[PDB]
A paper describes a structure:
The full-length [name] was produced in same way as for [name]-1, and was crystallized and diffracted to 1.9 Å. [name] has one molecule in an asymmetric unit and comprises 39 β-stands, 5 α-helices and 9 310-helices. Compared with [name]-1, two 310-helices (η3 and η4 in the loop connecting α1 and β9) are not observed due to missing density for residues Pro103–Gly122. The β31–β32 loop hosts Ser435, the only insertion in [name] (530 residues in total) relative to [name]-1 (529 residues). The substrate tunnel of [name] passes through the helical dome. The second missing fragment hosts Leu430, the counterpart of [name]-1 Phe430, and its lack of electron density allows the tunnel runs towards η9 and η10. The ligand bound to [name] was modeled as an imidazole, and the configuration of the [name] iron center was highly similar to that of [name]-1.
Sequence homology indicates that the two enzymes belong to the carotenoid cleavage dioxygenase family that share a seven-bladed β-propeller fold with a nonheme iron center. Here we determined crystal structures of [name]-1 and [name] at resolutions of 1.8 and 1.9 Å, respectively. Structural analysis reveals that [name]-1 and [name] are strikingly similar to each other.
Residue numbers in the entry: 1 to 102, 123 to 389, 393 to 429, 437 to 529
Amino acid sequence: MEKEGFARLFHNFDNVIEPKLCSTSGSVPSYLKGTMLRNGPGMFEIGDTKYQHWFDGMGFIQRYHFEDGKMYYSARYLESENYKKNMEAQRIVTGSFGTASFIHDNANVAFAPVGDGLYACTETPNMHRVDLDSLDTLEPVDFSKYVALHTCTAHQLFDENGDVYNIGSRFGPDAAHVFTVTKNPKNLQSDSDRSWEHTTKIGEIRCSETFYPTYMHSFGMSENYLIMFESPIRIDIKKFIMKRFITTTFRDCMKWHADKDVKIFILNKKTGEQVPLKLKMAPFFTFHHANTFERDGCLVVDYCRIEQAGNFDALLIENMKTGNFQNDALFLPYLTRVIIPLSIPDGAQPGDDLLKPLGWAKGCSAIFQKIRLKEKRVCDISMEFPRYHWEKINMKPYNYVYGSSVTLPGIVKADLENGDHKVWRRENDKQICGEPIFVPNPEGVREDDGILIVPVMTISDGQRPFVLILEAKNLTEIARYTIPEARIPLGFHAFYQGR
Ligand SMILES: [Fe+3]
């Protein structure tokens, strides 16, 4: 293992079974009491075989437990069927996003709450419940038992009732994006308070090109609508169905179709009917939607926009190892807003900007041609892993998005109202900020009355990783928990459970 560099983070991680008391500085308010689980890849080589892509590594879940003003750290591999088969063979024997083999249930991306249960997910129907304390891998769940689909996002969205929504893709001559709702099992007669049994298909929207469905990482949800982009990154289905004959991967069947505009698909959550508009915009890709809401007959969709991503060559392990392959400015994400009229007024003329009357929409336009949408950048400081104050303004007009940078910007708070953005600056270039999680003050009234939990990775053996606690109004540090391990993973998403 190197003393310095991103290569440090691609050596295999070891389990940390007994929760380790971390070193405290500062102090936290009484309402920081709960457990954050963080998902991501931890194992990048097995025996004589190595994974190719960042997204491939075996899921390695960390637990950051907050109690009595202290933090405790532990971490364990998800014991998926893939993990267990690979560990027994001592080689990479099951496929992954970007590596061919030498059931896809390596749920290394994020977590979905259903009732009182927490389910580790990847972009397949095959999930596992995980215990928030012991990090045991519990029962498997096959989401496709309830709705026929081949892939689905690991970014399920939920509402105040705890109902969980997702979009998946069903391949075939019929190819379609299927929109789903899973009713909270606590509010109905169910097998258990964590059962996925109340899952139905709301509706579906056919892919424009049956043999080139879009790749999709996330989507937006408002009070009445689910919205997705048909991105230029397309899965070559004919190539993919042959994968076991030509030794290829899912990622290698994806390409960015450079001559295609983006289409917007919108489904009414409650009617199940597609919004009957043809909506186009200039090409882009987004990993992560932020919040989504309705205002003045329009759907407002915020997201971190990437100009050009190919099929994610930039996130191959070899490319990230060097770190230097971060001078890819077309891959830098920016928080962006598009505003979509949900209807066209009688008498609209070609060239009319349907958003011109709406002063709050200035900077976006929606030109009647079909409607061509023009988005606007809402934060000039590049950011990714967006999060917001879900409890107060999910599906509602809102002011703030928190994200991570990827001089020395670390965490960014975008101000959608006035543009008074805030930044917590990293202390040196051996630090990397992870996804910030907003925890609300129970007695707060403003949208940013709360704190942020920020895991900070390091790429140097002279600096231990830590969890940073920021107050959310001005992003100043109020506490820091330094972890007695050499590394935490270059990970993906976290889930915080107050308790
Ligand atoms: Fe993600």
